[PDB]
Design an enzyme around this catalytic site. Structure first.
Site, PDB file in Angstrom:
ATOM      1  CD  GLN D  15      65.108  69.177 -18.686  1.00 50.79           C
ATOM      2  OE1 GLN D  15      65.664  70.203 -19.072  1.00 50.79           O
ATOM      3  NE2 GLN D  15      64.044  68.668 -19.294  1.00 50.79           N
ATOM      4  N   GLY D 143      63.513  57.953 -24.505  1.00 50.68           N
ATOM      5  CA  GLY D 143      64.908  58.296 -24.717  1.00 50.68           C
ATOM      6  C   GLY D 143      65.807  57.083 -24.837  1.00 50.68           C
ATOM      7  CG  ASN D 206      55.513  63.467 -21.056  1.00 51.19           C
ATOM      8  OD1 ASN D 206      55.537  63.814 -19.876  1.00 51.19           O
ATOM      9  ND2 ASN D 206      56.618  63.237 -21.755  1.00 51.19           N
ATOM     10  CD  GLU D 254      53.669  50.182   4.947  1.00 47.32           C
ATOM     11  OE1 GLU D 254      54.667  50.485   5.633  1.00 47.32           O
ATOM     12  OE2 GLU D 254      52.521  50.613   5.185  1.00 47.32           O
TER      13      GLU D 254
HETATM   14  N1  LIG Z   1      57.635  64.991 -18.535  1.00 45.68           N
HETATM   15  C1  LIG Z   1      58.820  65.177 -19.112  1.00 45.68           C
HETATM   16  N2  LIG Z   1      59.179  64.411 -20.202  1.00 45.68           N
HETATM   17  C2  LIG Z   1      60.383  64.592 -20.797  1.00 45.68           C
HETATM   18  C3  LIG Z   1      61.267  65.548 -20.317  1.00 45.68           C
HETATM   19  N3  LIG Z   1      62.376  65.514 -21.088  1.00 45.68           N
HETATM   20  C4  LIG Z   1      62.216  64.565 -22.037  1.00 45.68           C
HETATM   21  N4  LIG Z   1      60.983  63.990 -21.876  1.00 45.68           N
HETATM   22  C5  LIG Z   1      60.420  62.902 -22.696  1.00 45.68           C
HETATM   23  O1  LIG Z   1      61.403  61.901 -22.866  1.00 45.68           O
HETATM   24  C6  LIG Z   1      61.374  61.367 -24.174  1.00 45.68           C
HETATM   25  C7  LIG Z   1      62.784  61.363 -24.758  1.00 45.68           C
HETATM   26  O2  LIG Z   1      63.692  60.834 -23.819  1.00 45.68           O
HETATM   27  P1  LIG Z   1      64.882  61.706 -23.173  1.00 45.68           P
HETATM   28  O3  LIG Z   1      64.877  61.594 -21.667  1.00 45.68           O
HETATM   29  O4  LIG Z   1      64.750  63.144 -23.599  1.00 45.68           O
HETATM   30  O5  LIG Z   1      66.220  61.105 -23.847  1.00 45.68           O
HETATM   31  P2  LIG Z   1      67.499  60.631 -22.988  1.00 45.68           P
HETATM   32  O6  LIG Z   1      67.071  59.880 -21.756  1.00 45.68           O
HETATM   33  O7  LIG Z   1      68.363  61.814 -22.624  1.00 45.68           O
HETATM   34  O8  LIG Z   1      68.299  59.627 -23.961  1.00 45.68           O
HETATM   35  P3  LIG Z   1      69.070  60.097 -25.298  1.00 45.68           P
HETATM   36  O9  LIG Z   1      68.314  59.623 -26.515  1.00 45.68           O
HETATM   37  O10 LIG Z   1      70.433  59.460 -25.296  1.00 45.68           O
HETATM   38  O11 LIG Z   1      69.209  61.600 -25.331  1.00 45.68           O
HETATM   39  C8  LIG Z   1      60.429  62.224 -24.998  1.00 45.68           C
HETATM   40  O12 LIG Z   1      59.275  61.501 -25.360  1.00 45.68           O
HETATM   41  C9  LIG Z   1      60.055  63.378 -24.096  1.00 45.68           C
HETATM   42  O13 LIG Z   1      58.691  63.704 -24.232  1.00 45.68           O
HETATM   43  C10 LIG Z   1      60.912  66.322 -19.220  1.00 45.68           C
HETATM   44  O14 LIG Z   1      61.687  67.172 -18.784  1.00 45.68           O
HETATM   45  N5  LIG Z   1      59.685  66.131 -18.620  1.00 45.68           N
END
Ligand SMILES: Nc1nc2c(ncn2[C@@H]2O[C@H](COP(=O)(O)OP(=O)(O)OP(=O)(O)O)[C@@H](O)[C@H]2O)c(=O)[nH]1
Ligand SMILES: Nc1ncnc2c1ncn2[C@@H]1O[C@H](COP(=O)(O)OP(=O)(O)CP(=O)(O)O)[C@@H](O)[C@H]1O
Ligand SMILES: Nc1nc2c(ncn2[C@@H]2O[C@H](COP(=O)(O)OP(=O)(O)O)[C@@H](O)[C@H]2O)c(=O)[nH]1
Ligand SMILES: [Ca+2]
Ligand SMILES: [Ca+2]
Ligand SMILES: [Ca+2]
Ligand SMILES: [Cl-]
Ligand SMILES: [Mg+2]
Ligand SMILES: [Mg+2]
Ligand SMILES: [Mg+2]
EC number: 3.6.5.-
Lengths: 425, 348, 54, 440
Positions: D15, D143, D206, D254
């Site tokens: 995203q 995640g 975040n 760099e």
């Molecule tokens: N800044 C920002 N943080 C995000 C976003 N989407 C998820 N996060 C953060 O990512 C963390 C969770 O990780 P995810 O990237 O959603 O999970 P994943 O990488 O898909 O891994 P899975 O557990 O298998 O779904 C949370 O703490 C969220 O706050 C986003 O679009 N922008």
């Protein structure tokens, strides 16, 4: 993580299970004939979690109806949404279980279980990505208690890498059919501690007190009790049935809610408490009530324990900012009741679609150590009879030994001790 | 209901603050490891400032300024004054000092020491560490004792012409309590104290350290006249002022307190940009204890700053109440000030 | 305060200013780790199916 | 010209990647259908923008990007979205079930059955390069996929592209938008396994982005859309030198040279200003001195910490808009005499400055107002270790009770890896203290 296979076993299981499908079908805009007549597309975005899609865009519940007697399942088929269910998914015997766990688990149910697993297998094979199963049943009877836990043990053997969830109704002397309910419950809890990931403990003691004290129903019926259950079930499954970030599937829910394998017995809550009112409820009011002990579906005082984990779900159009503020307010003003060794153990979700009849609602899911009060209660009722070996002949006649009762008792007493361990940690 | 935590059980000052807070019935005490607090009465050593201001829905406050140790350490204070342009080497109110390790300044220390061997001037110096004091006009001695120890010491010019309370012909030092709030308003407690010496001063035997060290500890033990002139060798401002009026025909405000207020403000405005919590995610306040000396010319000299001071026994009640009023209740409102606000805007 | 290495172009320019001078595992080893974890899963599952078999 | 391949892992990575490439296209004048009128060399070239985009005979400009996620719903929105035409199907990779916020599930279990596919799909892009620089990896710490699978990918990339550089854009977990309790676990675990394989990692808390959105954009409750559009601006500022003509940070090598003297200490703190609401009716445009001064306010950092109570090892100032060297030096001169900026003794006290005359581009209908000049400061300060302390504390609180540990062990991981990873972080925290703090 998409499809969930629902199962409902026994009188209680099928009756609450029936109401559950009546409720969420209305939320998803499905009519008794299986046709969609909704307005929003939020209703169909994750409809496949609970419904299979047939020709003519008919939506068929991924539900399997089980019972050792055709009585209740005839009533379901005649009920409001009776015709929505897949006819082949009706699996029933004739003998019944006579409120005997042994009959449902070892004799009568053993004869029927294979035919159920044939239906479970059919459904599972058509799943693009089966995430697991959810079961509805009581623990005080024979079929839902005895055969329900038998199904769970069989399902785990064939699907060991999928989540097993349950909505288990706990027996209470204040709402009792037979004196052997503590026996059936204790034997069932032993099974649930080992073979489930997440169990929503629904105490008939609590459901009755709510109907009596709060809803001012002088003579509560099982129908009145089930109005509360179907509302709770709709709530705790909201994150599963609609687009969301938090606890959107059964596995992620288990990871957030279950710090230890055996401590997966949850205390559900709901607000506002309703009976079959036009009060516009504010976010501060939802937050206060959902955490109120008088809104808990398990007769346990939350102040007698500590919250390991919590999952809150607000439904309706409201201020996201205000929701966050209030959820932080309850934590900060009652921080002593949330364990400090699990940081940020309260997760919150919001869904723009409220349940029927309400503008705003809130569902509470808590893993409190106070749940031990529930198992302590059953243990005392159990021991009161078992010390004199009363009513055991019903079970030994079906091949059970006293040793198996002793073991089941000890394991539940261990569960109580394990909750007390983390209440003082 | 506000919440706070206690992480320093050995603090008499904030033990009283803790008591007062509870008495308001609007402050609750949490376990010292509960993160959901509004206020931290933190520890002295390794206070985790890094974990403050990261709790949503909580305005967090702490009773210490991160980096304030620069002012409250012997070696640090000397370095701060000599390297800060606003204090500079041309600092008239700080005794000539040098930092000595057992970088080091042993080289430069001897340079000025020689001009006093040459210049016939009083070449007496004191050595101390941040127990462990020696006073002598012989540098050869001074440098030896430091090497005998294992930590950093500072050599400082010993004021050989101190003011002396009569009757007694005795030494003293002044202790001022300063409160710096979250807005960095500098509040001088209007009640200070003179930790007096109960033995007559004597500039012939600098080893008899009972008439030279005005420490309440050394006085309550090694001295034999403890409690003769004042109750526990502690003269307060009302008396010390009357004494100055009768003996020297002056007031405490004019002859001494102007210099003190100048020194306090000068020291804190120097480090302000380095410790201020104006735009931070958490905020700090702190109680400091400045120790001063007064020579016979009624000139004030700064000795040290204490970052974790105790109060005089009869002044706890009033001071501790003032801390809650100005430093705590200012950030967390409940349902004739005892302080003097140190401010000055001279245009040029 | 010395400016150095000043480079200029149509889209911009860059430089440096100085205020004061100076006072891996192989594929074999990875696959072994992933397989060792896979086998630990198979063992835990085998123990379960053994328990259920009983 | 040398190519750079972007890699986006998990929901956060994907995203954020979406927002970045959306912004890249606007800045380079590339339309959603992949066409780029201003580009006159049809079907090829070696301009500066070609570092991030390839070219087809039709005149289509394709991101050198790979999107990976163990579940399809998020990447599916890319396949159907505004920039569906921009990406080739083989660039978008999806599994069926995700890592369920479990590092072990993402690293060991599910990671094993998709890792070979991803590498081969990356190899397809690598073959299209004349001289590959390395990789930019976007992911989250919290995640299961973002933490677990990324670490596995970073290990293999060091095997298949051992000479290539690897930069990270990592999202540090914040409870105000976190979706799991075990994100601290996943963070320490992935940081430990990824540490030796990363050359330079830009952390974004975040929490910091959330409060900047509340404070400066007047957003009551920021969504990921709000967060990502802001994050994309910072990422754009950092990568702009790879995509535009210049002489500062013109290759991935760099970045390490300028910002990372010590390899383990490779987490530069980013600070960005100004952030102005598009809804703000009246706004007085800020000067070079004002936005440069803002680079030393914690409220504008990608991570909330206090650089005053640490030491610098390097500092880079990336300007975009109406800025000339004379105004910069004047501002730096003023700031030096008003703020606490102490470098380590073994480094020069100085600033490497880069200026692009084109001011920041903003998404139409976005929350950010267009400004005539902005700056992104990249400073390697020891104060960022506070974030590690925050994270490691939460870890220690849960691990002392072995809470949620069974979820990881159940996926084949050993309980020993928890302590190994934690011990590595303990060493890391100690390294920061040695470099940044004197014995009081
Ligand atoms: N800044 C920002 N943080 C995000 C976003 N989407 C998820 N996060 C953060 O990512 C963390 C969770 O990780 P995810 O990237 O959603 O999970 P994943 O990488 O898909 O891994 P899975 O557990 O298998 O779904 C949370 O703490 C969220 O706050 C986003 O679009 N922008
Ligand atoms: N430069 C100097 N000239 C004269 N006397 C001095 C002096 N420096 C210290 N003293 C004497 O030492 C006494 C206190 O010493 P200091 O002021 O160094 O506090 P401390 O650090 O010694 C006590 P604590 O360990 O409780 O903080 C003073 O009252 C004074 O009598
Ligand atoms: N909430 C609720 N509980 C029920 C209902 N029917 C039975 N029970 C409870 O379940 C227990 C009896 O089990 P039951 O389901 O009737 O027997 P089964 O058919 O063998 O599963 C008793 O403790 C009852 O209190 C019902 O309709 N609603
Ligand atoms: Ca039969
Ligand atoms: Ca071209
Ligand atoms: Ca490497
Ligand atoms: Cl290579
Ligand atoms: Mg019945
Ligand atoms: Mg068969
Ligand atoms: Mg995901």
């Amino acid at each position: 993580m998409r499809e969930i296979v629902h199962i409902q076993a026994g009188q209680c299981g099928n009756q609450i299970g029936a109401k559950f499908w009546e409720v969420i079908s209305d939320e998803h805009g499905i009519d008794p004939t299986g046709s969609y007549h909704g307005d929003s597309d939020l209703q169909l975005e994750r409809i496949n979690v609970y419904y299979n899609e047939a020709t003519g865009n008919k939506y068929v519940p991924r539900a399997i109806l089980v019972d050792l007697e055709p009585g209740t399942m005839d009533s379901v088929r005649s009920g409001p949404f009776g015709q929505i269910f897949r006819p082949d998914n009706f699996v029933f015997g004739q003998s019944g279980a006579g409120n005997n766990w042994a009959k449902g688990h070892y004799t009568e149910g053993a004869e029927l279980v294979d035919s159920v697993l044939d239906v479970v297998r059919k459904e599972s094979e058509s799943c693009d990505c089966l995430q697991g199963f959810q079961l509805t049943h009581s623990l005080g009877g024979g079929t839902g208690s005895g055969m329900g836990t038998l199904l769970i043990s069989k399902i785990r053997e064939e699907y060991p890498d999928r989540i097993m969830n349950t909505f288990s109704v706990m027996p209470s002397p204040k709402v009792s059919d037979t004196v052997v309910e503590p026996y059936n419950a204790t034997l069932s809890v032993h099974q649930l501690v080992e073979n489930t990931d997440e169990t929503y403990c629904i105490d008939n003691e609590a459901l009755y007190d709510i109907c009596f004290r709060t809803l001012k129903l002088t003579t509560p019926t099982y129908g009145d009790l089930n109005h509360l259950v179907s509302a709770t079930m709709s709530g705790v499954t909201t994150c599963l049935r609609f687009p969301g970030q938090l606890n959107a599937d059964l596995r992620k829910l288990a990871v957030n809610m279950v710090p230890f394998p055996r401590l997966h017995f949850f205390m559900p809550g709901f607000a506002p408490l309703t009976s079959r009112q036009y009060r516009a409820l504010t976010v501060p009011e939802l937050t206060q009530q959902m955490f109120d002990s008088k809104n808990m579906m398990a007769a346990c005082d939350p102040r007698h324990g500590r919250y390991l984990t919590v999952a809150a779900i607000f439904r309706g159009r409201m201020s996201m900012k205000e929701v966050d503020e209030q959820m932080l307010n309850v934590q900060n003003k009652n921080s002593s009741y949330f364990v400090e060794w699990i940081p940020n153990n309260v997760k919150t979700a919001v869904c723009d679609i409220p349940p029927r009849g309400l503008k705003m609602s809130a569902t509470f899911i808590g893993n409190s150590t106070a749940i031990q009060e529930l198992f302590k209660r059953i243990s005392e009722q159990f021991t009161a009879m078992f010390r004199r070996k009363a009513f055991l002949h019903w079970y030994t006649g079906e091949g059970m030994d006293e040793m198996e009762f002793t073991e089941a008792e000890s394991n539940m007493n261990d569960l109580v001790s394990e909750y007390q361990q983390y209440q003082d940690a | 209901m506000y919440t706070f935590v206690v992480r320093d059980e050995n603090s008499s000052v904030y033990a009283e603050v803790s008591r007062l807070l509870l008495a308001t019935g609007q402050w609750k005490r949490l376990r010292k490891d509960n993160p959901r607090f509004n206020l931290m009465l933190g520890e002295r050593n390794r206070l985790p400032f890094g974990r403050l201001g990261h709790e949503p829905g909580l305005v967090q406050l702490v009773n210490y300024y991160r980096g304030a140790d620069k002012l409250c350490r012997k070696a640090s204070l000397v370095k701060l004054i000599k390297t800060s342009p606003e204090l500079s080497e041309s600092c008239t109110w700080f005794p000539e000092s040098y930092v000595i390790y057992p970088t080091d300044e042993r080289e430069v220390f001897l340079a000025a020491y020689n001009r006093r061997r040459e210049g016939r001037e009083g070449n007496v110096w004191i050595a101390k560490s941040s127990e462990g004091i020696l006073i002598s006009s012989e540098a050869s001695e001074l440098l030896d004792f430091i090497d005998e120890q294992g930590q950093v010491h500072v050599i400082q010019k010993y004021l050989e012409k101190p003011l002396l309370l009569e009757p007694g012909h005795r030494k003293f030092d002044i202790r001022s309590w300063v409160l710096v709030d979250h807005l960095y308003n500098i509040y001088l407690y209007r009640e200070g104290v003179l930790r007096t010496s109960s033995e007559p001063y004597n500039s012939a035997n600098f080893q008899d350290k009972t008439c030279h060290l005005t420490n309440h500890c050394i006085q309550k033990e090694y001295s034999k006249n403890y409690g003769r002139y004042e109750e526990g060798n502690e003269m307060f401002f009302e008396e010390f002022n009357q004494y100055l009026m009768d003996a020297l025909n002056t007031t405490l405000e004019n002859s001494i307190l102007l210099q003190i207020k100048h020194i306090i403000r000068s020291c804190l405005m120097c480090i302000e940009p380095a410790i201020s919590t104006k735009h931070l995610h958490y905020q700090s306040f702190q109680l400091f204890g400045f120790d001063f000396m007064v020579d016979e010319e009624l000139k004030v000299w700064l000795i040290e700053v204490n970052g974790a001071p105790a109060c005089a026994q009869k002044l706890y009640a009033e001071l501790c109440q003032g801390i809650v009023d100005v430093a705590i209740s200012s950030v967390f409102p409940l349902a004739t000030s005892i302080f003097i606000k140190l401010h000055h805007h001279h245009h040029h | 305060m010395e400016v150095i290495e000043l480079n200029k172009c149509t889209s911009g320019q860059s430089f440096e200013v100085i205020l004061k001078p100076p006072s891996d595992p192989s594929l074999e080893e990875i696959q072994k780790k992933l397989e060792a974890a896979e086998e630990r899963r198979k063992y835990q599952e085998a123990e379960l199916l053994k328990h259920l078999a009983e | 010209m040398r190519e750079c391949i972007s890699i986006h892992v998990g929901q956060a990575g994907v995203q954020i990647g979406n927002a970045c490439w959306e912004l890249y296209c606007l800045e380079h004048g590339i339309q959603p259908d992949g066409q780029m009128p201003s580009d006159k060399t049809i079907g090829g070239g070696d301009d500066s923008f070609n570092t991030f985009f390839s070219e087809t005979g039709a005149g289509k400009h394709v991101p050198r990007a790979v999107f990976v996620d163990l579940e399809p719903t998020v990447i599916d929105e890319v396949r159907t979205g505004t920039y569906r035409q921009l990406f080739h199907p083989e660039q978008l990779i999806t599994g069926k079930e995700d890592a369920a916020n479990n590092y072990a599930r993402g690293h060991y279990t599910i990671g094993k059955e998709i890792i070979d596919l991803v590498l081969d799909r990356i190899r397809k892009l690598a073959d299209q390069c004349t001289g590959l620089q390395g990789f930019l990896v976007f992911h989250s710490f919290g995640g299961g996929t973002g933490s677990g699978f990324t670490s596995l990918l970073m290990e293999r990339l060091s095997v298949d592209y051992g000479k290539k550089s690897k930069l990270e854009f990592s999202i540090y977990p914040a409870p105000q938008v976190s979706t799991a309790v075990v994100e601290p676990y996943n963070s320490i675990l992935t940081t430990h396994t990824t540490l030796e394989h990363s050359d330079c990692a830009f952390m974004v808390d975040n929490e910091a982005i959330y409060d900047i959105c509340r404070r400066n954009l007047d957003i009551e409750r920021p969504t990921y859309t709000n967060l990502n559009r802001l994050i994309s601006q910072i990422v754009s500022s950092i990568t702009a030198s790879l995509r535009f003509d210049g002489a500062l940070n013109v290759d991935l090598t760099e970045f390490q040279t300028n910002l990372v003297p010590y390899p383990r200490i490779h987490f530069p703190l980013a600070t960005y200003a100004p952030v102005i609401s598009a809804e703000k009716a009246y706004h007085e445009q800020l000067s070079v001195a004002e936005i440069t001064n803002a680079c030393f306010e914690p409220a504008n950092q990608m991570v909330k910490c206090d650089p005053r109570h640490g030491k610098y090892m390097a500092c880079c100032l990336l300007y975009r808009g109406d800025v000339v060297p004379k105004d910069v030096n004047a501002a730096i001169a003023t700031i030096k005499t008003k703020r606490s900026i102490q470098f380590v003794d073994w480094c020069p006290t100085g600033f490497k400055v880069g200026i692009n005359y084109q001011p920041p581009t903003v998404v139409p209908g976005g929350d950010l107002a267009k400004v005539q000049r902005a700056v992104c400061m990249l400073s390697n300060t020891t104060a960022i270790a506070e974030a590690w302390a925050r994270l490691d504390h939460k870890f220690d609180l849960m691990y002392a009770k072995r809470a949620f540990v069974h979820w990881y062990v159940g996926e084949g991981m050993e309980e020993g890896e928890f302590s190994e990873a934690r011990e590595d972080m303990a060493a890391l925290e100690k390294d920061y203290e040695e470099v940044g703090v004197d014995s009081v």
